[PDB]
Design a protein around this motif. Sequence first.
Motif, PDB file in Angstrom:
ATOM      1  N   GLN A 228      41.777  37.442  38.697  1.00 32.77           N
ATOM      2  CA  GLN A 228      42.052  37.723  40.227  1.00 32.77           C
ATOM      3  C   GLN A 228      41.027  37.141  41.060  1.00 32.77           C
ATOM      4  O   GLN A 228      41.264  36.752  42.221  1.00 32.77           O
ATOM      5  CB  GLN A 228      42.382  39.168  40.473  1.00 32.77           C
ATOM      6  N   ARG A 229      39.988  37.405  40.625  1.00 33.66           N
ATOM      7  CA  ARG A 229      38.681  36.861  41.540  1.00 33.66           C
ATOM      8  C   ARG A 229      38.867  35.381  41.444  1.00 33.66           C
ATOM      9  O   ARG A 229      38.617  34.655  42.880  1.00 33.66           O
ATOM     10  CB  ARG A 229      37.296  37.511  40.654  1.00 33.66           C
ATOM     11  N   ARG A 230      39.093  34.760  40.418  1.00 33.11           N
ATOM     12  CA  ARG A 230      39.253  33.181  40.579  1.00 33.11           C
ATOM     13  C   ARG A 230      40.218  32.646  41.139  1.00 33.11           C
ATOM     14  O   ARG A 230      40.284  31.550  41.621  1.00 33.11           O
ATOM     15  CB  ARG A 230      39.104  32.713  38.887  1.00 33.11           C
ATOM     16  N   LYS A 231      41.393  33.407  41.410  1.00 26.68           N
ATOM     17  CA  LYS A 231      42.312  32.872  42.374  1.00 26.68           C
ATOM     18  C   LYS A 231      41.873  32.794  43.802  1.00 26.68           C
ATOM     19  O   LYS A 231      42.015  31.635  44.463  1.00 26.68           O
ATOM     20  CB  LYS A 231      43.632  33.952  42.161  1.00 26.68           C
ATOM     21  N   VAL A 232      41.160  33.729  44.115  1.00 25.80           N
ATOM     22  CA  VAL A 232      40.523  33.797  45.493  1.00 25.80           C
ATOM     23  C   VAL A 232      39.101  32.980  45.620  1.00 25.80           C
ATOM     24  O   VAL A 232      38.879  32.275  46.670  1.00 25.80           O
ATOM     25  CB  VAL A 232      39.959  35.219  45.898  1.00 25.80           C
ATOM     26  N   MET A 233      38.460  32.624  44.273  1.00 23.74           N
ATOM     27  CA  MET A 233      37.233  31.809  44.451  1.00 23.74           C
ATOM     28  C   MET A 233      37.699  30.345  44.460  1.00 23.74           C
ATOM     29  O   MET A 233      37.118  29.724  45.076  1.00 23.74           O
ATOM     30  CB  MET A 233      36.610  32.052  43.108  1.00 23.74           C
ATOM     31  N   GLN A 234      39.004  30.014  43.991  1.00 24.06           N
ATOM     32  CA  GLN A 234      39.463  28.777  43.910  1.00 24.06           C
ATOM     33  C   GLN A 234      40.125  28.441  45.544  1.00 24.06           C
ATOM     34  O   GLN A 234      40.012  27.090  45.915  1.00 24.06           O
ATOM     35  CB  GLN A 234      40.452  28.523  42.960  1.00 24.06           C
ATOM     36  N   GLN A 235      40.570  29.455  46.099  1.00 26.50           N
ATOM     37  CA  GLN A 235      41.132  29.297  47.545  1.00 26.50           C
ATOM     38  C   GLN A 235      40.012  29.093  48.437  1.00 26.50           C
ATOM     39  O   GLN A 235      40.364  28.111  49.233  1.00 26.50           O
ATOM     40  CB  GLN A 235      41.873  30.631  47.669  1.00 26.50           C
ATOM     41  N   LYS A 236      38.842  29.488  48.274  1.00 28.88           N
ATOM     42  CA  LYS A 236      37.654  29.289  49.151  1.00 28.88           C
ATOM     43  C   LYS A 236      37.017  27.896  48.836  1.00 28.88           C
ATOM     44  O   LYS A 236      36.603  27.248  49.592  1.00 28.88           O
ATOM     45  CB  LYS A 236      36.647  30.409  49.015  1.00 28.88           C
ATOM     46  N   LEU A 237      36.983  27.639  47.514  1.00 29.52           N
ATOM     47  CA  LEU A 237      36.535  26.465  47.023  1.00 29.52           C
ATOM     48  C   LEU A 237      37.517  25.150  47.469  1.00 29.52           C
ATOM     49  O   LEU A 237      36.653  24.184  47.930  1.00 29.52           O
ATOM     50  CB  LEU A 237      36.368  26.313  45.530  1.00 29.52           C
ATOM     51  N   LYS A 238      38.581  25.308  47.686  1.00 30.76           N
ATOM     52  CA  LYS A 238      39.427  24.356  48.327  1.00 30.76           C
ATOM     53  C   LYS A 238      39.249  24.387  49.933  1.00 30.76           C
ATOM     54  O   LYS A 238      39.184  23.325  50.688  1.00 30.76           O
ATOM     55  CB  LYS A 238      40.945  24.509  48.280  1.00 30.76           C
TER      56      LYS A 238
ATOM     57  N   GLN B  47      30.042  27.113  43.647  1.00 23.50           N
ATOM     58  CA  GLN B  47      30.810  28.485  43.232  1.00 23.50           C
ATOM     59  C   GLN B  47      30.214  29.666  43.330  1.00 23.50           C
ATOM     60  O   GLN B  47      30.997  30.667  43.896  1.00 23.50           O
ATOM     61  CB  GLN B  47      30.856  27.897  41.721  1.00 23.50           C
ATOM     62  N   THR B  48      29.027  29.884  43.279  1.00 22.30           N
ATOM     63  CA  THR B  48      28.491  31.202  43.487  1.00 22.30           C
ATOM     64  C   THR B  48      28.165  31.556  45.024  1.00 22.30           C
ATOM     65  O   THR B  48      27.864  32.743  45.078  1.00 22.30           O
ATOM     66  CB  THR B  48      26.886  31.021  42.826  1.00 22.30           C
ATOM     67  N   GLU B  49      28.226  30.512  46.040  1.00 19.70           N
ATOM     68  CA  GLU B  49      28.608  31.102  47.113  1.00 19.70           C
ATOM     69  C   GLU B  49      29.906  31.551  47.430  1.00 19.70           C
ATOM     70  O   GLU B  49      30.052  32.635  47.996  1.00 19.70           O
ATOM     71  CB  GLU B  49      28.548  29.763  48.090  1.00 19.70           C
ATOM     72  N   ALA B  50      31.182  30.922  46.776  1.00 15.42           N
ATOM     73  CA  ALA B  50      32.581  31.549  46.985  1.00 15.42           C
ATOM     74  C   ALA B  50      32.758  32.748  46.141  1.00 15.42           C
ATOM     75  O   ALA B  50      33.741  33.377  46.306  1.00 15.42           O
ATOM     76  CB  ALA B  50      33.153  30.382  46.752  1.00 15.42           C
ATOM     77  N   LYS B  51      31.794  32.854  45.186  1.00 17.32           N
ATOM     78  CA  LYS B  51      31.835  34.093  44.344  1.00 17.32           C
ATOM     79  C   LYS B  51      31.584  35.198  45.160  1.00 17.32           C
ATOM     80  O   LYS B  51      32.168  36.196  45.205  1.00 17.32           O
ATOM     81  CB  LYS B  51      30.873  34.260  42.952  1.00 17.32           C
TER      82      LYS B  51
ATOM     83  N   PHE C   9      31.858  35.727  48.715  1.00 20.92           N
ATOM     84  CA  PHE C   9      33.188  35.943  49.522  1.00 20.92           C
ATOM     85  C   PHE C   9      34.104  36.738  48.758  1.00 20.92           C
ATOM     86  O   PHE C   9      34.614  37.959  49.043  1.00 20.92           O
ATOM     87  CB  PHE C   9      33.563  34.768  49.914  1.00 20.92           C
ATOM     88  N   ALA C  10      34.448  35.996  47.522  1.00 20.80           N
ATOM     89  CA  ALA C  10      35.722  36.652  46.421  1.00 20.80           C
ATOM     90  C   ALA C  10      35.296  38.160  46.121  1.00 20.80           C
ATOM     91  O   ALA C  10      36.058  38.835  45.833  1.00 20.80           O
ATOM     92  CB  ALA C  10      36.009  35.835  45.403  1.00 20.80           C
ATOM     93  N   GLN C  11      34.049  38.458  45.741  1.00 21.37           N
ATOM     94  CA  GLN C  11      33.610  39.820  45.373  1.00 21.37           C
ATOM     95  C   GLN C  11      33.743  40.982  46.497  1.00 21.37           C
ATOM     96  O   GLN C  11      33.912  42.109  46.206  1.00 21.37           O
ATOM     97  CB  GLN C  11      32.272  39.700  44.921  1.00 21.37           C
ATOM     98  N   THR C  12      33.516  40.592  47.513  1.00 23.71           N
ATOM     99  CA  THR C  12      33.748  41.547  48.900  1.00 23.71           C
ATOM    100  C   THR C  12      35.228  41.872  49.156  1.00 23.71           C
ATOM    101  O   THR C  12      35.779  43.012  49.008  1.00 23.71           O
ATOM    102  CB  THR C  12      33.215  40.671  50.083  1.00 23.71           C
ATOM    103  N   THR C  13      36.193  40.667  49.141  1.00 25.25           N
ATOM    104  CA  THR C  13      37.314  40.983  49.723  1.00 25.25           C
ATOM    105  C   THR C  13      38.391  41.730  48.822  1.00 25.25           C
ATOM    106  O   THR C  13      39.332  42.429  49.383  1.00 25.25           O
ATOM    107  CB  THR C  13      37.891  39.536  49.868  1.00 25.25           C
ATOM    108  N   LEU C  14      38.175  41.598  47.317  1.00 29.14           N
ATOM    109  CA  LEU C  14      38.859  42.466  46.382  1.00 29.14           C
ATOM    110  C   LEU C  14      38.341  43.916  46.503  1.00 29.14           C
ATOM    111  O   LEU C  14      37.224  44.025  46.698  1.00 29.14           O
ATOM    112  CB  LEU C  14      38.818  41.973  44.934  1.00 29.14           C
ATOM    113  N   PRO C  15      39.110  44.883  46.003  1.00 28.60           N
ATOM    114  CA  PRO C  15      38.874  46.237  46.635  1.00 28.60           C
ATOM    115  C   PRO C  15      37.481  46.850  45.961  1.00 28.60           C
ATOM    116  O   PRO C  15      37.222  46.471  44.679  1.00 28.60           O
ATOM    117  CB  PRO C  15      39.992  47.143  46.304  1.00 28.60           C
TER     118      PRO C  15
END
Lengths: 124, 131, 105, 182, 46, 200
Positions: free
Chosen positions: B117-127, F176-180, F182-188
Amino acid sequence: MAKLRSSITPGTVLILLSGGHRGKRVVFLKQLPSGLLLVTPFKVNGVPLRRVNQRYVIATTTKVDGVDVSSIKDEQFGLPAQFKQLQDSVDKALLASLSKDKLLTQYLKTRFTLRGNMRPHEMK
Amino acid sequence: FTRYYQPGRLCVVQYGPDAGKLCFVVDIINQTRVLVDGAGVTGVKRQSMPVRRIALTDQYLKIPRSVRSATLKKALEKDDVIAKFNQSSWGKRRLAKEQRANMSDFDRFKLMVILKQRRKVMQQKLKSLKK
Amino acid sequence: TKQPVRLYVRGIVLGYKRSKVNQYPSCSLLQLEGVNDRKDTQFYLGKRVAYVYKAKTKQGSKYRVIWGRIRRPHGNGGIVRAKFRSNLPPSSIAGRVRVFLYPSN
Amino acid sequence: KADPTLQQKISQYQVVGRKQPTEAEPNPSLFRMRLFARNKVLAVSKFWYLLKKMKKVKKSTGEILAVNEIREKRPTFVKNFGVWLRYDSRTGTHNMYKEVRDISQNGAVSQLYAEMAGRHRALPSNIQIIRVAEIKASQCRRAHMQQLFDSKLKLPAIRRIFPTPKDKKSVFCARKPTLFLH
Amino acid sequence: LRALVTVWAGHLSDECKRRFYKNWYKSKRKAFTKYAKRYGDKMEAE
Amino acid sequence: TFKKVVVIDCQGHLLGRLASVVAKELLKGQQIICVRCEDINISGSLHRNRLKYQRFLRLRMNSNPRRGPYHLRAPSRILWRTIRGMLRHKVERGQKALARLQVYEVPTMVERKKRMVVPSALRIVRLKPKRNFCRLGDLSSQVGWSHGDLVARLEEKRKTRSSAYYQKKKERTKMQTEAKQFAQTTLPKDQVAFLQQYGH
RNA sequence: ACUCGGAAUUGAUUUCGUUCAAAGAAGGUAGGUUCCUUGUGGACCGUUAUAUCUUUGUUCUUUCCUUUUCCUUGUGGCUG
RNA sequence: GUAAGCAGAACUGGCGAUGAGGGAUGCUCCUAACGCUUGGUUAAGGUGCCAAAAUGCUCGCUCAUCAGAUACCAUAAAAGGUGUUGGUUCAUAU
RNA sequence: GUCAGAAUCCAUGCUGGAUAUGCAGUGUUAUUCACCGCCUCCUUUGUUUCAUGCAAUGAUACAGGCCUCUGGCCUGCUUCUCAUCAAAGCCCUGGGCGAGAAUCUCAAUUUCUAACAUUGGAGGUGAUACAUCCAUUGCAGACGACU
């Protein structure tokens, strides 16, 4: 008769190790003679009421809490009409309870792989 | 040349029966092997452990030389070095390898559902960050 | 496509129980992936094993099996002894072998 | 759980025999000796061998009263030992004085049979350790002892080859290792 | 050493071309005929 | 119980200590490449090892030395012998083991794949420091292996090639580790504390 | 074949450990002096002071090891 | 007898008449003596690879421009060395 | 830690390379139904020392290194990716829809991987040659071979 192990309390999730439904995670109801485990929800997993032998089964720490149980016996198990009705009678209580948790409903519906790096003696 | 075999240096014990537990040095016996111990709550009984077995940790509590196993416990509780090591990296991933070993099957399932589920959001930002 | 979802530990046939100068091909000899001491081995004792292989002809399918099981450990490394229904063929050496994880505990 | 591998299995034993009563000579004079050995049996063996050199006595003509095990007083802390010994080279006999450092007398004598074999090729059979006294720091006369003495002593860990616990070991790795460590 | 690429000329004589046959009198003498039309269409790729 | 291929980098490595590991793995059925075999090391000085290689050249079949011991000058071909020295190679099984092995003195092909290291058979670990050692690339070029300075040039060429690959990857390891983060914040906020138990 | 476990006993009637008390010491802390290469420094003097340790009593602990005899649950093998 | 895998005796044990495991290889050394075999345990001897089992743990010594490496056994000596590691005993730090 | 240094050693040069059952480049590739290629699509069989994620591309040093570098990291690929939600199935440009899956009656290899060769079909593009005997030669030659 075959003694149970201290892992398997009623309720608990197993995983099947052989046969047509290998991998799949399945909840335990009651030990029956022939000392076999009655292990059964058919909407979720797609496995019925069936007797699984104790030794083709890994027990798990995960658990679930209505069900009839005590009427069903080994005379039953040894396309069909009555069996399909007995099935959906038995899983009245569980389908209501497993409507709640969607991490738990997925956990049943996925099946267990030996994935590469993991060593099943240093398991849990 | 940081890190000295001296009194009250913290050590990770890498080989031997203890395997993975933490210990303090007391005293140097000779040019190999040292008077390692722990008052608690690592719980490694005091002994003449070799130098090869024990990785030196950054943190030390300063105490004089050959030392009673009680008078660690008093000097430990003021500093709390075992806590302070455990804050830093190396300290963190030591506890990770303890708690990865002790996972249930559902607890291992939990992890990979969150990580995907992290990787769905990780790939959305990477695009999106590309755009 | 491929085999979905493997429930076995995977294993190599090293040889037979031997000296310098004598086979004892009754007792086969087996290395498992991951497993590296006697202490790690005591999971796998009892647990049932299969050499699979394929042949030119028998009963509606080209593959054969020889079932067996794990018996006891072998030396301070991970390596572990086995017994099959037949003795194992010396064609089967450096050859892959499926250790299933039943019977369970 | 306590690791068997580090030390030799030496234990110190007191022994006391007394020859044997006779109608000529009743109530003899008693003996005593501290010895190092594997065992309660093998101390008595070594007692009769050594007592044969001193006085006209044998195992047949003698009688043994007590084999007391002795240990350290306090084995927690480190102390200096001045060991006196003799051994037999392929020429002849030589007395020595070695100085060893460990927590226990048992630990010192284990460390000495290693040291003595390694240097002088002296076999277990030839060596006879005469007495193992405790020594003050301002007493050891050997230079390898003196460097260690003093508070605030420090020793940096250099070139860190770790003996990996088995199972930890793998034949292949990716990264290439790191020995300066820091 | 290892040969990367041989380039050849446009027009070889029958003097050179005899080398490539063991029987010249029989053959229809095809050597460098597909190459010659390929050359006119040259080798500044190769 | 093993990978498909295992490519070995052979710099820093001791020659026998490597070979004895590599031999037993070929018998267990693993398929192996060795790579950068010129840089492999041996204990003893250069003079000492060349004197030992001169005792090897002295051997020949006196009747007809066409037939006899083939003295192989290349580092790749030298390592190949000592692996074969640790195999019963006359028997059929032994021969199969060599078949698996591939030795190179780095080509194309497996620059693109990862190279692993046997840690037990390694000079910084084993040889107590000060104790003099010798590189096989030097020992071979002493004894009539002509191609020292090509394997200099080609490596020095494809190290520049690889550092161009590195700085692409190193930029998109950041990315990738920049976009990690962001993604680690937004999930609960429950499942963030869940991952910090188990490291991720 | 390998194991999780315990229950009493023997020695030095405790090896240790641990709480205090006095005494003593150095591989000398606080404290003075003083010195550079400024240090997680060294010489001189100081005896517990803003660290301690050891000897000798004492406070309450049954395990380290080592005698002695005996009841245990967990997995696996071979034969019937 | 200079000596000999030389000649001649005494006591016991072997080989001969006897395989098996070890000493790479060996009629005489070591372990150990044999009906066909299933399981378990050792002996001598070994555990980097060939080769079944430790690149196990722990403490010393050694750098060889001919290192060394396992009884019988497949050779080495007198005499030297300020190469290095310890010891013994004198004389003012050497 | 270096330096000079020989009728020596190893190269170089020279001889062979059917002394590696070694390896590369280039020419031409069968008179037009007649076989023969190459590239896709999909089926017959039969090979494999060995499919079940049989996975992962800086370059160094070790009395030091690496950078996202006023900081941070090392003490192991012990990691980091990959693995979900119905079938090894069917439908929509690679992600996403739904569906009573069992009585495969307590386990029976989880029969489908990979490229290599081959039998016969679809569509796209192509090609219309040499060698040996024979006679002749003598730079060659016991006969083969060689020019």
